Short mmCIF file of C-alpha atoms in Angstrom, two decimals:
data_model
loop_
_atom_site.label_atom_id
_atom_site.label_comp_id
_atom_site.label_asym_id
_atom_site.label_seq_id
_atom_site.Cartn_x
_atom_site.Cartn_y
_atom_site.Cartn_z
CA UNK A 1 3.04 -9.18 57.54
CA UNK A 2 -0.38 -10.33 59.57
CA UNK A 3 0.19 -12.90 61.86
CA UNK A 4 -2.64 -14.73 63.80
CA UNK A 5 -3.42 -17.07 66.53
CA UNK A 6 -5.70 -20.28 66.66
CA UNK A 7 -6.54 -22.36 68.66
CA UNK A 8 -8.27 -25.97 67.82
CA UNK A 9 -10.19 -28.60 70.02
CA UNK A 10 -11.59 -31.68 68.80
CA UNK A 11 -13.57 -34.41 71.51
CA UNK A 12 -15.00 -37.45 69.98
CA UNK A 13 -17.22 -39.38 71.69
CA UNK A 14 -16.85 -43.55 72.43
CA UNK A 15 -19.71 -46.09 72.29
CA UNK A 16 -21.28 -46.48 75.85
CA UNK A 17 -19.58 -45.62 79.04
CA UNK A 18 -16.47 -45.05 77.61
CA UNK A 19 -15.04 -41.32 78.13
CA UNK A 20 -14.48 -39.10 75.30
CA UNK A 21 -11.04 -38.45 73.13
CA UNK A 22 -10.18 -34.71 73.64
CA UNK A 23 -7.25 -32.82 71.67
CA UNK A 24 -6.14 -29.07 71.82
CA UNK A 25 -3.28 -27.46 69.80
CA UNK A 26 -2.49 -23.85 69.34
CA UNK A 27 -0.85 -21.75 66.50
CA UNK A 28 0.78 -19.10 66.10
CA UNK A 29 0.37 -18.23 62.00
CA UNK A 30 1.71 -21.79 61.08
CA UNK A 31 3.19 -23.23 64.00
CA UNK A 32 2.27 -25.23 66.53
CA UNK A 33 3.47 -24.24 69.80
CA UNK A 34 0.98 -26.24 72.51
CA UNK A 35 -0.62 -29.59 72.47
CA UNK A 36 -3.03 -31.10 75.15
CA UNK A 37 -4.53 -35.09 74.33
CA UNK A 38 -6.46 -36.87 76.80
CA UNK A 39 -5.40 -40.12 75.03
CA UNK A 40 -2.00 -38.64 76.27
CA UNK A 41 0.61 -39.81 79.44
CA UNK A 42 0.67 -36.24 80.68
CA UNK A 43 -2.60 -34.53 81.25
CA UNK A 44 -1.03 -30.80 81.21
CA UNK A 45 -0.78 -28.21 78.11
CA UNK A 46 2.44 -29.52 76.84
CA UNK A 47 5.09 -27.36 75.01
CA UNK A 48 5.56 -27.22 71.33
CA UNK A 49 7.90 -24.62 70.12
CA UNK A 50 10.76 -23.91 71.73
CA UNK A 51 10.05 -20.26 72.71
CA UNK A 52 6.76 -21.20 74.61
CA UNK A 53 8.96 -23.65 77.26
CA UNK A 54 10.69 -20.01 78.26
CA UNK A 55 6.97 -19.74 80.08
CA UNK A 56 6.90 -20.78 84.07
CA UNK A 57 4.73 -22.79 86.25
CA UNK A 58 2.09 -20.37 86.29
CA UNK A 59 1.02 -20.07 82.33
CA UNK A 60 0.88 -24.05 82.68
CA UNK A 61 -1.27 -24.41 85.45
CA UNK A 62 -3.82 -22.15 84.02
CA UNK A 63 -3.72 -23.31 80.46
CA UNK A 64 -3.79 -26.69 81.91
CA UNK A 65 -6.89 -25.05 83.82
CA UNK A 66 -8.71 -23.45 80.85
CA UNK A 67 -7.75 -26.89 78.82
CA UNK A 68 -9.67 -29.07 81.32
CA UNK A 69 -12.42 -26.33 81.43
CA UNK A 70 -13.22 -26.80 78.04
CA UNK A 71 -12.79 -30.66 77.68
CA UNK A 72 -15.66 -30.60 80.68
CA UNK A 73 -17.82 -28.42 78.71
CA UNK A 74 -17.12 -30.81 75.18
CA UNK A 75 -17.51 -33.52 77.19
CA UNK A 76 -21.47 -31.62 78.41
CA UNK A 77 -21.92 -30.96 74.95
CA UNK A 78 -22.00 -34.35 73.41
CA UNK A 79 -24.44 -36.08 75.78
CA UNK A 80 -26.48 -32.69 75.03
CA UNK A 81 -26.60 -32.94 71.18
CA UNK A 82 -27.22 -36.50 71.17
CA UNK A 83 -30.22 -36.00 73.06
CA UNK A 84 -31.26 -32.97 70.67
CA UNK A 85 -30.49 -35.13 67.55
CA UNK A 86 -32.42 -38.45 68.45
CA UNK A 87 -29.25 -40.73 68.59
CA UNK A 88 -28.31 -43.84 69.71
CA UNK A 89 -25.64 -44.29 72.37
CA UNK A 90 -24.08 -47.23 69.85
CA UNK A 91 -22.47 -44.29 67.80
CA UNK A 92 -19.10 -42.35 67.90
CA UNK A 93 -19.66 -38.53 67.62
CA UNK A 94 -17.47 -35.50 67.07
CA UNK A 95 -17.78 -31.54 68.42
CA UNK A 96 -15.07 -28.94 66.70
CA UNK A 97 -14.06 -25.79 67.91
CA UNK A 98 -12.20 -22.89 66.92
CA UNK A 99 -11.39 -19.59 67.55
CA UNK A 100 -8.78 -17.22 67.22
CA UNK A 101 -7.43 -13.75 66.32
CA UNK A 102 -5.85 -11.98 63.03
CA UNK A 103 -3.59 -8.92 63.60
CA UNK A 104 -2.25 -6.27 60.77
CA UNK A 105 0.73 -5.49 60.02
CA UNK A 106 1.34 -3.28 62.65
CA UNK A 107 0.33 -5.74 65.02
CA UNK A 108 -3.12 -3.89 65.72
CA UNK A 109 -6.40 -6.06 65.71
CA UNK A 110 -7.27 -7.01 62.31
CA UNK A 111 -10.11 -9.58 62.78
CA UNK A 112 -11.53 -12.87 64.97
CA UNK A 113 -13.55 -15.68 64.95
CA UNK A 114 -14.81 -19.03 66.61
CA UNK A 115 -16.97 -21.47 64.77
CA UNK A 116 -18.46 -24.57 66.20
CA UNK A 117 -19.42 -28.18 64.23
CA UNK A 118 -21.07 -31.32 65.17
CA UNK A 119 -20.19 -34.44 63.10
CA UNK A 120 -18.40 -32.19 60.42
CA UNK A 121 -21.27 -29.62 59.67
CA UNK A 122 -21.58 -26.24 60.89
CA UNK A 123 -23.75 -26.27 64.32
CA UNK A 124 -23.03 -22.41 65.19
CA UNK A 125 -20.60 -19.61 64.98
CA UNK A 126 -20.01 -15.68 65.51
CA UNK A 127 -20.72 -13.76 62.82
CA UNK A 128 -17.86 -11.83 61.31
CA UNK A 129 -18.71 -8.35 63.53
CA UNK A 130 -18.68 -10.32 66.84
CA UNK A 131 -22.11 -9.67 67.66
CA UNK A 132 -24.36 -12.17 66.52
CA UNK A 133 -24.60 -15.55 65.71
CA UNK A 134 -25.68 -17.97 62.41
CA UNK A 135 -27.33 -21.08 63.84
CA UNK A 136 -27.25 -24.22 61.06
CA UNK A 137 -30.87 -26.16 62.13
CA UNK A 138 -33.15 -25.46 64.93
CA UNK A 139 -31.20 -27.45 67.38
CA UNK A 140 -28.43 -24.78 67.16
CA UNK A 141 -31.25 -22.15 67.70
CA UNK A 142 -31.58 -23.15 70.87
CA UNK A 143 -28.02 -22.62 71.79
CA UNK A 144 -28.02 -19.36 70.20
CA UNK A 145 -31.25 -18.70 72.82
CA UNK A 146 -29.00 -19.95 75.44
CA UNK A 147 -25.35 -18.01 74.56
CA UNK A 148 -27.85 -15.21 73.80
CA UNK A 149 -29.20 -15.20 77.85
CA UNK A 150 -25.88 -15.68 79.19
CA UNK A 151 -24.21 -12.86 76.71
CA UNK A 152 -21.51 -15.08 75.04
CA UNK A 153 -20.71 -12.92 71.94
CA UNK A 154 -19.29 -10.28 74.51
CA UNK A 155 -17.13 -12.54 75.92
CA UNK A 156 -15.61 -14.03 73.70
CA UNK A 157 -15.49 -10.97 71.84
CA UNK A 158 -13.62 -9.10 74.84
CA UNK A 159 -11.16 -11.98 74.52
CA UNK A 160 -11.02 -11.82 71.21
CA UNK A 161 -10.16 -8.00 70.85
CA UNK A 162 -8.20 -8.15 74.01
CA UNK A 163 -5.78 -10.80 75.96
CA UNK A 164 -5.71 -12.91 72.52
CA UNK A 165 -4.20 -9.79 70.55
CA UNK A 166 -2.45 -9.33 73.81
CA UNK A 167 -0.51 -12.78 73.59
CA UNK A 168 0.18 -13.21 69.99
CA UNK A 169 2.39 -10.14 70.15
CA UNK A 170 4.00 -11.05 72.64
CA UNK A 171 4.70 -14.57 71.46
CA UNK A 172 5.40 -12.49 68.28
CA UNK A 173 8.02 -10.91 70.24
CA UNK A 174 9.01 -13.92 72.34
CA UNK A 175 9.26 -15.74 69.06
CA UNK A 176 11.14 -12.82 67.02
CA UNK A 177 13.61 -15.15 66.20
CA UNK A 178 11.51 -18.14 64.64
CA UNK A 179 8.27 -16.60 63.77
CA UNK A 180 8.84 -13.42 62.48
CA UNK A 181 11.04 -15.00 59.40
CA UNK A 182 9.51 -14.97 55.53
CA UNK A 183 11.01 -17.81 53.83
CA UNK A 184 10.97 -17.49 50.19
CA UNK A 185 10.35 -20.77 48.14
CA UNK A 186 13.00 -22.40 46.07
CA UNK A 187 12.17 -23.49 43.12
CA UNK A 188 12.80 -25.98 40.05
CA UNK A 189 11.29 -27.83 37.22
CA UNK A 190 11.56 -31.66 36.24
CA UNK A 191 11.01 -33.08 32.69
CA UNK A 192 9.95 -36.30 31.66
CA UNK A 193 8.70 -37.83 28.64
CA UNK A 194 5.18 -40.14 28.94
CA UNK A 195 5.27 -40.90 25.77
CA UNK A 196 6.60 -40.23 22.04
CA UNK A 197 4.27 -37.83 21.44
CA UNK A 198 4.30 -35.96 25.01
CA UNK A 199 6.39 -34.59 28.55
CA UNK A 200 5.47 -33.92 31.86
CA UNK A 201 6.43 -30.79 33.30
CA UNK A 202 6.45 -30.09 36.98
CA UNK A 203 6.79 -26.85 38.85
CA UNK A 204 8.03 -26.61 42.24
CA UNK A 205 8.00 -24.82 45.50
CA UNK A 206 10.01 -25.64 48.07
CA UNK A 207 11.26 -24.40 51.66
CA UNK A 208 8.71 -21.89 52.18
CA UNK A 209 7.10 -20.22 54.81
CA UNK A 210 4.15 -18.90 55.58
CA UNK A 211 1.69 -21.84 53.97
CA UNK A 212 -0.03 -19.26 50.97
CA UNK A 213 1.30 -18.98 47.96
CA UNK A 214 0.45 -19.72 44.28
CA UNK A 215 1.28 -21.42 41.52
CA UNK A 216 0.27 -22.03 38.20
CA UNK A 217 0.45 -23.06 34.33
CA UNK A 218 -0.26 -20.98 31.47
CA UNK A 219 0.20 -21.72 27.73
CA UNK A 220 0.85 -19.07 25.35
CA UNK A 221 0.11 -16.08 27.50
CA UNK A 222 -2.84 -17.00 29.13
CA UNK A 223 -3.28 -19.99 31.69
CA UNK A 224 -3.89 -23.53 31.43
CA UNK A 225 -6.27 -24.78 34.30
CA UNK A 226 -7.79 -28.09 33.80
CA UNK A 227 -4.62 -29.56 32.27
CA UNK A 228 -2.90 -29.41 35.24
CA UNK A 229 -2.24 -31.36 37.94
CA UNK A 230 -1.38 -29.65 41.84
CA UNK A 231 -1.16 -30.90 45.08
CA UNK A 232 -2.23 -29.38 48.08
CA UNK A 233 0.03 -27.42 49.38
CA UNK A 234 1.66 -29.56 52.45
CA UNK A 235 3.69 -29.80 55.15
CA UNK A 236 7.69 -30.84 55.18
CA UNK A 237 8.14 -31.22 58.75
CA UNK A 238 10.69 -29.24 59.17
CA UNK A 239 8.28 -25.55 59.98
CA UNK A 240 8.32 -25.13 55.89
CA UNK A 241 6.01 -25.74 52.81
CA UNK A 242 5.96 -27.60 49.70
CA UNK A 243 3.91 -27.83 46.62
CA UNK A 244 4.22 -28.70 42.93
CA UNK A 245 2.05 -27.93 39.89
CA UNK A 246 2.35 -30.48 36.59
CA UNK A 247 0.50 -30.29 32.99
CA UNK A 248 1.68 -33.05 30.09
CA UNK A 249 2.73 -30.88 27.17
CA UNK A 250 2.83 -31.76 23.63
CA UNK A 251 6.75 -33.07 23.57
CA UNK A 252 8.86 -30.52 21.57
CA UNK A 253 6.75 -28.03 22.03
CA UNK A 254 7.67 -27.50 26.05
CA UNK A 255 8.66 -23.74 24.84
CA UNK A 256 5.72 -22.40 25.23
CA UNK A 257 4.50 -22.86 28.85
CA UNK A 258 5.87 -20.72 31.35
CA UNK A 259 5.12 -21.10 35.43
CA UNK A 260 4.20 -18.57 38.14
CA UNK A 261 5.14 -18.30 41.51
CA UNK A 262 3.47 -15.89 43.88
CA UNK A 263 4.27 -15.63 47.72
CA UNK A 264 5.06 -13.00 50.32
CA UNK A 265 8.77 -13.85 50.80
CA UNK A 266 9.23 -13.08 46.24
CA UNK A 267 9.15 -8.66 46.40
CA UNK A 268 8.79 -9.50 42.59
CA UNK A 269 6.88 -12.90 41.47
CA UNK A 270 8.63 -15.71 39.53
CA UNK A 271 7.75 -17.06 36.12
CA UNK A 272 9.59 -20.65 35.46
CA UNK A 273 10.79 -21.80 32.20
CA UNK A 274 11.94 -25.40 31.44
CA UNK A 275 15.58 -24.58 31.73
CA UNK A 276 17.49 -27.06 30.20
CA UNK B 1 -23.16 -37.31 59.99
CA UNK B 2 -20.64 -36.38 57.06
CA UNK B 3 -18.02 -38.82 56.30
CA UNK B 4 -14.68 -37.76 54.13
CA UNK B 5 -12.03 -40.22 52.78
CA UNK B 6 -8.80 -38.76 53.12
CA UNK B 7 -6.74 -37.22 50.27
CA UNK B 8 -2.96 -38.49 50.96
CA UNK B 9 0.34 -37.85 49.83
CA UNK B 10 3.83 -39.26 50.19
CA UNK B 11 7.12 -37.84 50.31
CA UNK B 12 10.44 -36.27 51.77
CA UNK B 13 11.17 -33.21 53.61
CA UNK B 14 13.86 -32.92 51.68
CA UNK B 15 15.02 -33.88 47.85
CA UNK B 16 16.17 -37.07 47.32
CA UNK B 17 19.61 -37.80 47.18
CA UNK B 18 19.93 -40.88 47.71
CA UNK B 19 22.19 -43.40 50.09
CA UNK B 20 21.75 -40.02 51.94
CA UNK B 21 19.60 -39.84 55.21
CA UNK B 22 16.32 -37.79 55.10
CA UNK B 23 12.64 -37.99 56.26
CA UNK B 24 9.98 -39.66 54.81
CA UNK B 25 6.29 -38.02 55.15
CA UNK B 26 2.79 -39.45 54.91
CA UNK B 27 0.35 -36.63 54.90
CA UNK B 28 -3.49 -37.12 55.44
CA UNK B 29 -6.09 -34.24 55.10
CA UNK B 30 -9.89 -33.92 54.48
CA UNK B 31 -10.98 -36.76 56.35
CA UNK B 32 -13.40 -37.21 59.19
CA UNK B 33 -14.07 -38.59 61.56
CA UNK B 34 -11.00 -38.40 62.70
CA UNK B 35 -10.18 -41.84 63.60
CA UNK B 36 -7.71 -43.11 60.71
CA UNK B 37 -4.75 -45.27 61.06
CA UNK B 38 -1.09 -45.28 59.19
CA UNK B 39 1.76 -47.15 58.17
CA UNK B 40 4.73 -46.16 56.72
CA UNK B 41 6.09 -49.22 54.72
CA UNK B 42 9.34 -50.18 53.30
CA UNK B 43 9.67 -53.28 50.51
CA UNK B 44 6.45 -54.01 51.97
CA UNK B 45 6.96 -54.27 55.68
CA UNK B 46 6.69 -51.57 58.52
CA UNK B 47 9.13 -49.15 59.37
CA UNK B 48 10.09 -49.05 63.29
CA UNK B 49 9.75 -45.27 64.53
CA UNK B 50 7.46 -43.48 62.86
CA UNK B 51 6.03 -40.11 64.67
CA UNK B 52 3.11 -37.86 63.88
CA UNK B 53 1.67 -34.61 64.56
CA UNK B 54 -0.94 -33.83 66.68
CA UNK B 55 -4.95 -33.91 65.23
CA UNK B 56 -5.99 -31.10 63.76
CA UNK B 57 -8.33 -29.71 61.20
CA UNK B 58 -9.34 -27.52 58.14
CA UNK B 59 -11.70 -24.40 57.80
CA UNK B 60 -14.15 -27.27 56.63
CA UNK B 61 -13.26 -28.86 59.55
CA UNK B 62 -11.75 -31.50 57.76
CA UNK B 63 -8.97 -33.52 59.50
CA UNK B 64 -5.35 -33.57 58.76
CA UNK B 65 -2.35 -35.59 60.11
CA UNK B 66 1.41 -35.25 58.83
CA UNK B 67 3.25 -39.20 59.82
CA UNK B 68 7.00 -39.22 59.57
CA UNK B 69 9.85 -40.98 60.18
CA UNK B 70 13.85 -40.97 59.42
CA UNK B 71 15.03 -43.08 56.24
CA UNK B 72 17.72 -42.84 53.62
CA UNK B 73 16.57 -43.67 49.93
CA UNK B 74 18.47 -45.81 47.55
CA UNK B 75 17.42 -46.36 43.60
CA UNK B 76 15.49 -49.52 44.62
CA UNK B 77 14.16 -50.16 47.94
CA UNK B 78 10.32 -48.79 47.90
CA UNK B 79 8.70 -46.77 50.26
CA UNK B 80 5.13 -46.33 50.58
CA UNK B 81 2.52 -45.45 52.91
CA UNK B 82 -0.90 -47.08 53.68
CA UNK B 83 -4.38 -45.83 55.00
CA UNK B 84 -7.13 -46.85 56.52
CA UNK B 85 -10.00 -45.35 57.78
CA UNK B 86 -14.18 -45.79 57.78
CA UNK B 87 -14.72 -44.35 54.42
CA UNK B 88 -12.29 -47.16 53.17
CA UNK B 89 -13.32 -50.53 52.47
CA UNK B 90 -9.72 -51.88 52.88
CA UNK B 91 -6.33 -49.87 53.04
CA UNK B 92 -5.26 -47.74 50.78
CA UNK B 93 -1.62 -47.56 49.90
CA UNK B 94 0.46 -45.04 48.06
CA UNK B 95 3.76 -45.61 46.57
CA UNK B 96 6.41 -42.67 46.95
CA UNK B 97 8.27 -41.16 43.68
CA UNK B 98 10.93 -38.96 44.64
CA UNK B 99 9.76 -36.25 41.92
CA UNK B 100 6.00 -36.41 43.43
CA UNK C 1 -3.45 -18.15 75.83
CA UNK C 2 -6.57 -19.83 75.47
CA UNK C 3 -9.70 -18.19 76.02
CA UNK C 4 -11.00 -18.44 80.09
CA UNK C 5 -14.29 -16.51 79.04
CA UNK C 6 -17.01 -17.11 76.19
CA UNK C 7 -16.89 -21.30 76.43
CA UNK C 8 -19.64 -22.85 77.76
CA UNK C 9 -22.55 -25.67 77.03
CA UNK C 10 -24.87 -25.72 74.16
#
């Protein structure tokens, strides 16, 4: 299948002369494999997955490196777009980042990205062809003026299309054993009566992995949608997926709603019955 | 400045079973800022090592936290799990069902 | 591998 790799800061600022919070983690597809926090008793890119602590001294000391590079630069940032937004020092502030890369499934270069908010709203990011830039507001034009000068589309673009491709497939490869699995999701059905006059049904997915994947409710043929209760999908803890999808049914008449499953890990896609 | 109030959910890694041991999950998304705090509770009181992930967020740059710890379920002690955060004008606590 | 290139102030 595609696989892809993220990575994720986050660096909040603190009222007065307080120093900012600053948090890294990096993915590969689903899983977390590094974590740097400078509320943290370490200070160093830490190890997440067990086939990233085969790396030696030297990948830590320069992610470490490029980790502390950035949290300087966050840490720039914020006293910058306070000053361009008119704000107080009283308030706590926030500056997102991420970029990344998506490969085929050959492993080839498929697409990539980085995209940049301030307080939870898009400030700037690289347009889709990795040439130009969509600034939100006119504060963010500036910045595009400045990454413009100093040519940061190319950049990050020949990191992009290069040493991040480079790295995924070789943690791809250095993670054969782990990442490389499709887990299909198991699934079953509850039934319980809310009243005399009507049942719940629920639908679920369990144990899967990757994250996408799709169910839903349908009536006769066609679907209920609005009748139905579903949960995001979320997280077990264990490196798989969950999810359930629920409509109340007129009781007795449970017969006639059917549920569909729809993953990567099912060659053929599901439809659930209540199976009593 | 947008603010979100988290969406959360409660439950176990794996199906209950009951007077067998298993994990119980609170998971917090679509929130910001990203300051939030969370208790895992048990009959009421707090439970004694609970572990989380580390911060992330969403393609809307939401945030999202998964907070778990190690418990075995019985038919009637009652687990829950509690949140507060800015958008919140006191905590917010959600019982756990073992078929939700 | 995190990105050494492309990050820099607004």
């Amino acid at each position: 299948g595609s696989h892809s790799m993220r990575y994720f800061f986050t660096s909040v600022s603190r009222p007065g002369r307080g120093e900012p919070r600053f948090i890294a983690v990096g993915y590969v597809d689903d899983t977390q494999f590094v974590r740097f926090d400078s509320d943290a008793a370490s200070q160093r890119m830490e190890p997440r997955a067990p086939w990233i602590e085969q790396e030696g001294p030297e990948y830590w000391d320069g992610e470490t490196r490029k980790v502390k590079a950035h949290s300087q630069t966050h840490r720039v940032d914020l006293g910058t777009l306070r000053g361009y937004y008119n704000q107080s020092e009283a308030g706590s502030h926030t500056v997102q980042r991420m970029y990344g890369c998506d490969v085929g499934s050959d492993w080839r270069f498929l697409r990539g990205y980085h995209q940049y908010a301030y307080d939870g709203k898009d400030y700037i990011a690289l347009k889709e062809d990795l040439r130009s830039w969509t600034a939100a507001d006119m504060a963010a034009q500036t910045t595009k003026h400045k990454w413009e000068a100093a040519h940061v589309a190319e950049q990050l673009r020949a990191y992009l299309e290069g040493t991040c491709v480079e790295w995924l497939r070789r943690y791809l490869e250095n993670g054969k054993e782990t990442l490389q699995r499709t887990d299909a999701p198991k699934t079953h059905m509850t039934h319980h009566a809310v009243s005399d006059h009507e049942a719940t049904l629920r639908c679920w997915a369990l144990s899967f992995y990757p994250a996408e994947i799709t169910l839903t409710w349908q009536r006769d043929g066609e679907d209920q949608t609005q009748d139905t209760e579903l949960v995001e999908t979320r997280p077990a803890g264990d490196g798989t997926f969950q999810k359930w999808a629920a409509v109340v049914v007129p009781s007795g008449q449970e017969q006639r709603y059917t549920c569909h499953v729809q993953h990567e890990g099912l060659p053929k896609p599901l439809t659930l019955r209540w199976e009593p | 400045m947008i603010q979100r109030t988290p969406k959360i959910q409660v439950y176990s890694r794996h199906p209950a079973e009951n007077g067998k041991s298993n994990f119980l999950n609170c998971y917090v998304s679509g929130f910001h800022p990203s300051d939030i705090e969370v208790d895992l509770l048990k009959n009421g009181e707090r439970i004694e090592k609970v572990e989380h992930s580390d911060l992330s967020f969403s393609k809307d740059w939401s945030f999202y936290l998964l907070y778990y710890t190690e418990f075995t379920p019985t038919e009637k002690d009652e687990y829950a799990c509690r949140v507060n955060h800015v958008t919140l004008s006191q905590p917010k606590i959600v019982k756990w069902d073992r078929d939700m | 591998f995190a990105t050494g290139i492309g990050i820099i102030t607004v």
